[PDB]
Amino acid sequence: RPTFYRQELNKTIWEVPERYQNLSPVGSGAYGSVCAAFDTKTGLRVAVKKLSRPFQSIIHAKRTYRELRLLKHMKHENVIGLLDVFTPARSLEEFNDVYLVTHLMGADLNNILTDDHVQFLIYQILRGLKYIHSADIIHRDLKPSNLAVNEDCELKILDFGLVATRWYRAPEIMLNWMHYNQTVDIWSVGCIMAELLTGRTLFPGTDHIDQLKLILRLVGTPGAELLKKISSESARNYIQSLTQMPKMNFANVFIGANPLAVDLLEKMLVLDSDKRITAAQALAHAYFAQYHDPDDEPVADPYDQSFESRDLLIDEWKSLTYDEVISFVPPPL
Numbered sequence: 001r002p003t004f005y006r007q008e009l010n011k012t013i014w015e016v017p018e019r020y021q022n023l024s025p026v027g028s029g030a031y032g033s034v035c036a037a038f039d040t041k042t043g044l045r046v047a048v049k050k051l052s053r054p055f056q057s058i059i060h061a062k063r064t065y066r067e068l069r070l071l072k073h074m075k076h077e078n079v080i081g082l083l084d085v086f087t088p089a090r091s092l093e094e095f096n097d098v099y100l101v102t103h104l105m106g107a108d109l110n111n112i113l114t115d116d117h118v119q120f121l122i123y124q125i126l127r128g129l130k131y132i133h134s135a136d137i138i139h140r141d142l143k144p145s146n147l148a149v150n151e152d153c154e155l156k157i158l159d160f161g162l163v164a165t166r167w168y169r170a171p172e173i174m175l176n177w178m179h180y181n182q183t184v185d186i187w188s189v190g191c192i193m194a195e196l197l198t199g200r201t202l203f204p205g206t207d208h209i210d211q212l213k214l215i216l217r218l219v220g221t222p223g224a225e226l227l228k229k230i231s232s233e234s235a236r237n238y239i240q241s242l243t244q245m246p247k248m249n250f251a252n253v254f255i256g257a258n259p260l261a262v263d264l265l266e267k268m269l270v271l272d273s274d275k276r277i278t279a280a281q282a283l284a285h286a287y288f289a290q291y292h293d294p295d296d297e298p299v300a301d302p303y304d305q306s307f308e309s310r311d312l313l314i315d316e317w318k319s320l321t322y323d324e325v326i327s328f329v330p331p332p333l
């Protein structure tokens with residue numbers, strides 16, 4: 001067990017192993033405070049997140065368990081991974097705080113285009129998405145603030161920020177569709193790619209209604225092939241009661257863009273999620289010919305998500321989280 005040291009920062013206490021030095025607060029964080037730091041053991045600059053009230057309730061405890069399970073599983077260049085996880089607690093009985101460590105990241109996709117850069121950035125997204133989707137994991141919330149980018153133009157998918165979420169959301173989500181397929185994320189990639197090509201948010205709807213209205217103006221109202229798969233009586237009536245609109249030609253909309261990029265957008269931004277191109281198929285699209293390598297686009301180990309359907313007590317999610325802290329094996333050097 002490492003030797004811990006204790007210090008207060010931004011009016012909250014921090015107890016971390018000695019290896020992490022020069023803690024500098026970077027923000028309040030999503031659900032916990034974050035500091036930059038220097039990892040003396042590896043030489044890496046890192047981010048340490050102290051989760052806030054991680055076992056306050058059953059929802060909080062399951063969410064804490066979920067976050068640790070996800071980060072421990074992700075082992076891929078274009079997906080955020082876990083350098084370390086620790087607690088100052090010496091036993092389950094006194095276990096109350098959880099700290100997560102990963103590589104320090106500077107800019108997100110907003111803070112960073114030529115067509116070569118769009119190719120490379122979207123390629124890395126799809127490569128990380130292929131890995132995530134292969135583990136039966138849906139991101140559901142892809143957007144530029146969730147994508148970290150180096151000056152190297154290297155990119156990682158995150159599930160947090162360092163830009164309304166609705167702008168990149170698949171339409172089936174905003175219709176509160178019961179089931180979702182992995183290509184909700186491909187829709188988001190399409191919106192992101194269009195923005196990198198035009199410099200403008202593709203669908204900057206003010207709300208969900210305005211959002212769907214903007215979407216339909218580009219892709220057209222559902223055809224009969226899609227209408228026959230809509231089970232909601234109300235959703236079907238409203239859709240059909242709209243003035244039908246034709247799917248625009250994307251060449252006209254994305255004028256001057258690389259025609260291969262326009263073609264890929266047409267295969268991504270399809271209403272019928274059954275017809276959207278998958279991440280694996282998109283990596284083989286001719287638009288990525290100079291980056292695509294089928295032998296270096298790996299899939300993930302299977303991810304056991306059975307816990308999502310369980311209703312457990314707080315102390316049980318806490319104990320399961322403790323098991324995952326204890327069993328952690330750091331990445332090698």
Ligand SMILES: COc1ccc(OC)c(CCC(=O)Nc2cc(-c3sc(/N=N/c4ccccc4)nc3-c3ccc(F)cc3)ccn2)c1
Binds near residue numbers: 027028082104160161
């Ligand atoms: C110009 O700008 C900068 C200049 C200098 C800087 O440094 C001194 C920085 C710091 C940049 C930074 O924030 N870098 C960072 C953050 C995280 C985060 S952010 C988060 N939640 N944030 C929210 C907040 C609100 C809503 C949603 C999410 N969680 C983790 C995190 C996740 C996992 C983990 F193991 C550790 C930390 C991870 C890695 N790098 C910026």
Ligand SMILES: CCCCCCCCO[C@@H]1O[C@H](CO)[C@@H](O)[C@H](O)[C@H]1O
Binds near residue numbers: 018021
């Ligand atoms: C100013 C920066 C100081 C960094 C100190 C990192 C100290 C890591 O200290 C740890 O102490 C243990 C007990 O001696 C040893 O068993 C570990 O191998 C060692 O890494």
Ligand SMILES: CCCCCCCCO[C@@H]1O[C@H](CO)[C@@H](O)[C@H](O)[C@H]1O
Binds near residue numbers: 066070138139140
């Ligand atoms: C590797 C971390 C960045 C990519 C994360 C992709 C998966 C996000 O994961 C999703 O988060 C949702 C909200 O907690 C959960 O409800 C879903 O069950 C979970 O699959």
Ligand SMILES: CCCCCCCCO[C@@H]1O[C@H](CO)[C@@H](O)[C@H](O)[C@H]1O
Binds near residue numbers: 171
């Ligand atoms: C005007 C708004 C139209 C929204 C159309 C959304 C079509 C989404 O596509 C649908 O997604 C469902 C859930 O994954 C699938 O079960 C259906 O098979 C698929 O066609």
